[model samples]
Target: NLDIIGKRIEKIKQEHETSWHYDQDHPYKTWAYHGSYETKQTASSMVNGVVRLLTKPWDIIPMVTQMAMTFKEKVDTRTQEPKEGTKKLMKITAEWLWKELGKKKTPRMCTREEFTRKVRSNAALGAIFNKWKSAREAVEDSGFWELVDKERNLHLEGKCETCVYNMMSRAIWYMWLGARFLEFEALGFLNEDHWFSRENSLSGVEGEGLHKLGYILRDVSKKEGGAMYADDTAGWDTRITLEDLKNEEMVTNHMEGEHKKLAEAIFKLTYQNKVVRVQRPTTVMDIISRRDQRGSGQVVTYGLNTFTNMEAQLIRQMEGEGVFKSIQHLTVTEEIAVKNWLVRVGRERLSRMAISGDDCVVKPLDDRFASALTALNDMGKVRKDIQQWEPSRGWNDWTQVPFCSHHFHELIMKDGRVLVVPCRNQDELIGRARISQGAGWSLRETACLGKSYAQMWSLMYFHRRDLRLAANAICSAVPSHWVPTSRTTATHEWMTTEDMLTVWNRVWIQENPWMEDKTPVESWEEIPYLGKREDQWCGSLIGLTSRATWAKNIQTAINQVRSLIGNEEYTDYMPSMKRFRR
Candidate 1:
């Protein structure tokens, strides 16, 4: 849902505060009372608008939703208690505003003119002036007049300000409304000068001087009259008028009632646990034909009864169209599904394992390790076999370097009934454990003892043993040769996050070694990595290409040796090395 209402409130608040000058030359001077209240309203509107919008019909495209969410999130960051009473009230008001706008059946652009007129009309200007008048009246009634007299007396004495007391009301109003004006002006729609006058300018000059005089008066008044004049105009307890408070409350009440209905309606159409299955039965070729037919016509596909062949055909189509390549980084569910399929295929291949055209022996115990082998094979399938990653990049999206443990769970549950279900930690524990006659066991022990299905198949692997599977899982998993033992830490070096970074850094060093005398970069344009030079020599194999830099450096040395052949002398020159070998 678009956070239109909340954003509008925030805009209004900002316009009111900074007088439409966001620049440092006329910075918004936030205050403890009015500024704070207005800021809170801005935040409240932001959060409420987002919550209400999210509950609206999903007919709204996600980009629009995302834009609205981003705005709300930005505003909500200003406050911590998003669910505070005032915040809720503010949200309700936003929702009411949104629905009111909706009822008019007008697009936001269509309402822009109306909104501008409403904001700038004579009546609106009068309301602002009235607010200033009411505040001045309140100050006058509360002995503020006496403070002004004192300030004017001090100005005559050359000890206080000449215009501070005269323009104190302007300062207060500016502080209150300046931020709002600045926000509106940023949108390129506000006229800040409309509110300014020659008196206001003179008043501002005097107000600035009096603001300093306030400190002197505060100390002097306290010393001379004690508490008698301590609560004087310059240091009086500020309060919101009953009228303003009453009007804000009424606006809030009406908003809340409207938001409640929107929330209820949104809850009705959602299916929390719905799943779409993509497998049934059909020949691979037949499925492809059917999929192609469906693509040409608008048709719906659903459920576990859908054909697997059709799924494969759709995937192929997606792959050919570059859609599959575009999203190589699979989400959790997709990763799980891909891994499950890989394991199933790897197990089948392991069962038919061979050695140099001869079949290898099979053993039952090999099954334990076969499961591990399948797991490793599954990882590799995701890392390579599935053309589900971009090739023209520094980093592969599916790289397992920074391993995510949570993603591993998704891979494990892809084909199983466990699936990707959300579970409450406490509920899962209670459901998994069993207690005996007088005592209880830990939940893990209870589950391990046979309370769950996981215990029954905990040790299974490939159906049969195969040496090829063994080599693939253990040997190929490391960077070094297949027989690496305790002496080789290289195996350990390839298995974790730190090792991955070390490997990448080594590759970088091989290609662009640290120069003892670095090239001087005079400007951002001079940096090789920063400019259009990034595309040069992109596919060249002249320098580096390896899991580690070990091979790349050796290759570079060979190239240098080839270049030096005729220039450098050697004991055996060119083809003369034949005589030495003979």
Candidate 2:
């Protein structure tokens, strides 16, 4: 099941990896926000979304079934599976040709009026800014120009923002609604009768649904100084409300209820995927997490069966805005929010700078002493048929480098130096142990151990043995190869996370001699150590963080090798990460 998923992600990433702009002058200048930076980061993290889909089988099975039946690719009677890979290749090829030939050079951003007139003139959704018919009638909007007027200048006068949290309530509302707008349809989210209807979401609110939410937001933010900005968790305190505070009563306390409905619905669908076959499928994902843990530099699931009563995460914005009595009131509130956010962001810049500096290293392991090769005798027990990593130009998606044993990405050092130390992770060791104690242990042996990262380690040393299953040669299942050996091994010496990491760190220098001098990057574009992999030539230590971040780190690295790529120049516009924090 997951092999299919792994390949699915790899192929599509290849597809979308390709595909930018700009100007500012006198009065009309639009100083860019960090959105370009944020989007690039978001693009790399698309794999994270794949994880979410896996967690929710209700939707997956439905979508897969849909494709199975309606899709042009027919299933082979012999294997009883659709010819999706072949058909998908064709599909992607068409898209690729279109993108490479036409759209690659066709990037355009029409004026708001251009889009607006076209939308009203073209055709349309519903339930926003008061419902209406005739696309043209719906297009005539009020408070629209006013919305951008202040911010247009706000972006120009203010520090280029990396965050968009301190913006207006309506803007945040539209964005949040859009991200979760399909939640009801996808999950049938039994918010059923909360705002509009059980029947209506099928169609698709009432006044109190949105209006009361404003009151809750205003009051909840009161204790925080009513600043009208920041933190999704602060939207409601679960106290229900000041009046008669009952638990899930929407009508009486409509505000708190709606957010819950959306959050709950997203989380509710997990019931169908109650059991995870692997101990922790994302073990390799921690490669970067473990690496980023250098000192105080801080780096930043339950299942139910149905939408009836479940919780995912509330998709909320950092900027807090309320329904104002008048348009002028709204304009005023937005101005304050923007200014305060600027101050808050400035302080954030200071804090980030103070903490992560020269103290961090890409390759934190001291494996010259680490000497990460297997024992002389055990070397004979390792498999020997694995292919070598051939680093090439990075394609599109970002990847964690040097596999596991976490590498910290330094924002800046005097020389723009960053680290990429090498070490093996025990995710496979722990994962394998856990899988042995469960069913399907034999069937999923290779699937349980980390693949993306382990594929590197296995390819390096595990394959040296001439006497193991060819399929297991490049996976993370080698027992005798372990320094202390796996518990299941005939050696029976047992393994420790520390023992595996430390012993391997000592030996990794020898295992990957090329990595010896390539450990620290002075804001160079390619990370040869990690980027050397045939599939992961993404060549960026900070690529996992954000394109904006990578760009900035590089631009400053060059200006110093001073980095910060211009595309991600204004990363402040990135939104709240609470939802994606998972």
Candidate 3:
């Protein structure tokens, strides 16, 4: 009878912890869960296996909390489709390593109800992973999560680093999942919708919880480093590993005091150590650049997606309530030379101000921004010689000023110099050609030898349609010699002349004042192991240039808006704050 009563009490106690309450959203509470989990056996009978807890617990978040995201407009099949394609890709990526490892690949959608049904069927099924799909097979792999699971000891090794990172990233990905669930558990999120959710998590953003967690993984990765466990909230771990977890656990008791401090002192390690483990590269900015290290696509894209989304969100934010848009859409279509001068001055300043900083976090505090503005209003009003007003990079450097997208033409000048014209329609191109064959027009013919530079911006605006279209109607009137050869539905046409192959694709540029007096950028050169630009899609510029570089870009945009709103020194940066352009 005593053994029976004792057993019942223990079972009840474990159940109580499953429903326990604590500081629900401490940024590092995830560690407390890991510390307690590895060192102690609080729920050993119910919730303590990688298979149980880390497998497919994405279902654990409250139903509406999980569904609340307002995803953005689509581009790739991966980014667009919410249910079948997007979410399906999301599901696989969640437990994706298992798919790649060739042991267990579960692609079925486990909606919350299915997750609930499975959990009710098996007491050991934790609400973490989509493990219910293949328990028998999960038990099939040779991993640490045996019925298992590292104390690190570094050594040299040779492997396809990308393939290696590809594997490691996902491995880390699961732990990130593990970390999130544990974090929620620590926040008492396990048994609640975060009822009094201080973080206001119930209303999701453009991305869902799982992907957002992936973003946080990326944010914390370059942002934090090294693994640690401690009671104090900051990880100070020159301590020890498993043996320490045991002794640490050995020293701690339920109604506690002294042991609690150093007991989970390791747990106190706060910088989200799991992220620092793999994402320590400061930015996978160059990951796509390296041809040899070609892999890690699974998690790398997820990381990049967050940055891209943040960039977009910021753009939307700025356009909606700030001066960025005022300058952005300052249409000068109605004005003449005076209007051209005014619009030109505004854009030159905006251009210089935009890409104004160098290298590290490009805070608005930099002098180049205002000077670029200064360059726009320079002494060059004299126009004679390289005299007094040296130009800034973006002034009339039409090629570099930042505009989202538009059609442009490429034709060889008689001197073989390249001439580009903004072409909205063939009619538009001809109208832009000058005074309908007036003396100025024949003079234009003298300049152009009577050929139309008639060309379309042959590339996708990195594949965004809002910035493209209707210009293709010019295809019919285009010189028969000017054959189109693109693959986008937007058409494949380029006005052909001489030996020019098809017109090149991919067009966008960063704003920079250094361009004010700069010569036109030389077209498409392949210099040796050059800029990381090679690793990315140039047309869209969607990935990280460098974690810090990209974050600073976001910050500068934010800082720019602040520049106009009377807070030039302010950095209302988007953040996890630890890496605030500091």
**Reference-based lDDT, each prediction:** 0.21, 0.21, 0.22
Cα lDDT tens digits, model 2, 88-170, are 22222223222222221221222445435434433222212323443355446554444444333332332111111111101
lDDT preference between candidates 1 and 3, better one: 3
Across 1-582, the per-residue lDDT of candidate 3 in tens digits comes to 222123323333354454332323323311222111111110101111111111121223233122322200110011111222222222222232112211221112113333334334432222123343433344334441221211111001110111111113012222222222222222221113211111221111212211122222222223222211001101112111222122112212321332233223212221101112122132221110111111112222222222222222222222222223222123333223223332343222222111101001111212233122211111011111233334322122222222112222333333343333332322222222222221222221222221222233223221221111112212212232432321111112333443221233212112221113323333322101112342132222225243234334443333332333332222121221233426
Ranking by TM-score: 2, 3, 1
**lDDT tens digits, residues 1-582, model 1?**
112122322434454554322222211122111111112110101211211211222114343234333221111111112223223222233333223323323221112233244344311211122233433232334344354445334323323111100011112112122212211222111012211111221101111111122222222222211111000011111111121122222322323332323222111111110111111122000000000001100000111001111121222222322222223244455444444433343233222211110001111111222222211111111122223342211111211111101000111111121111111121122122111211233322221222111111111111111111211122112222112111111012222223222332232222222223323323211111101121112211112232124222323333342243223322211111122223
Relative to the true structure, candidate 3 reaches a TM of 0.18
Better of 1 and 3 by TM-score: 3
lDDT-based ranking: 3, 2, 1
Q: What is the lDDT of residue 569 in candidate 3?
A: 28
TM-scores across all candidates? Answer: 0.13, 0.18, 0.18
Question: Once superposed on the true structure, which residue ranges of model 3 sit more than 4 Å away at CA?
Answer: 1-131, 134-173, 176-178, 184-582
- Backbone clash count, each prediction separately: 20, 52, 37
Instruction: Give the number of the best model, judged by lDDT.
Output: 3
lDDT of 1: 0.21
